[PDB]
Amino acid sequence: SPRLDHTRAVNYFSKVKQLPLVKPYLRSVQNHNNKSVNESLNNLFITEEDYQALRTSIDAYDNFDNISLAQRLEKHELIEFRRIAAYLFKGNNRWKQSVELCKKDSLYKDAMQYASESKDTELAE
């Protein structure tokens, strides 16, 4: 733990096709807010289908690429991440989430709640 750079590790795992063993290695760790951690960590919770962790895996540590990440999620069928990719893209910025809807993901539900916090008034019209 103490006295590794982490940055020079996850790299050897990723191009190894075996990185998940480090799953728990990322447990007590991920306080380092390090990128390789969240970055593939998410990639992990994504293909693995984890949302509880993934959500909490980012409910604090905000060190990552707030973009493409939600790009692979939208391409899903299981709205779990198409629901969070919705969040992930919006993230403390409500304008994205709504201005990106259409037939699908038009939920008669959360759609009537994510507008409220907005500030661009006219968006109501």
Partner: protein
């Protein structure tokens, strides 16, 4: 230098090389053989990962 030794320079001499080039062997070959049956068991580790989780 000098030189002039032999019966002391070759008796233990023959020991090291011989009893060392076959005490070599092993590890290396052992390495991949076992490294084989292993990493692959890993490939299934992750594979069954996929299966259940889906």
């Amino acid at each position: 230098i000098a030189q002039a030794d032999r019966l002391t320079q070759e008796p233990e001499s023959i020991r090291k090389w011989r009893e060392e080039q076959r005490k070599r062997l092993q590890e290396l070959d052992a390495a991949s053989k076992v490294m084989e049956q292993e990493w692959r068991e890993k490939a299934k580790k992750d594979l069954e990962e996929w299966n259940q989780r889906q």
